[PDB]
Amino acid sequence: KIRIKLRGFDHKTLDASAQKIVEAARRSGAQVSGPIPLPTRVRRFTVIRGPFKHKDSREHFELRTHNRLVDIINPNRKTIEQLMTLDLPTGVEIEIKTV
């Protein structure tokens, strides 16, 4: 019922948040639908070298939008408690949806 999506920009710190969840989620609670990874937005981008007119000669760039998901089944007081209080999502903004 308490299903929480995960918006994040960098993949390394991403698991560290999900693992932080995964542990304390089950630890204090119960069955937590394991770290289900969601296909990254790899936003397409191109741009040439100079300020100039050498048309060719380009450097493509992209957006690296990483998103994941955590899902629980039990209404533990403590789960809710620390795991919506004890947080540090510096470059991670999370979605919280009561399905």
Binding site: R44, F45, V47, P51, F61, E62, L63, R64, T65, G91
Partner: protein, 60 residues
């Protein structure tokens, strides 16, 4: 024409087809990604200078 380009796009005239993009960190309109509000060139300068997050050297 350079100081007023910035003011036309800012003050906003009348009709809806009287509006145009502007790289605010280089004051230009042509090839300016609306998603960043920056020119391909401004995007580029701050990208190489290493200050653009959620973006990277695309490798695919």
């Amino acid at each position: 024409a350079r100081k007023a380009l910035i003011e036309k796009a800012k003050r906003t005239p009348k009709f809806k087809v009287r509006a145009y993009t502007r790289c605010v960190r280089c004051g230009r309109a042509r090839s300016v990604y609306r998603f960043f509000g920056l020119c391909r060139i401004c995007l580029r300068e701050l990208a190489h200078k290493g200050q653009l997050p959620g973006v990277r050297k695309a490798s695919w």
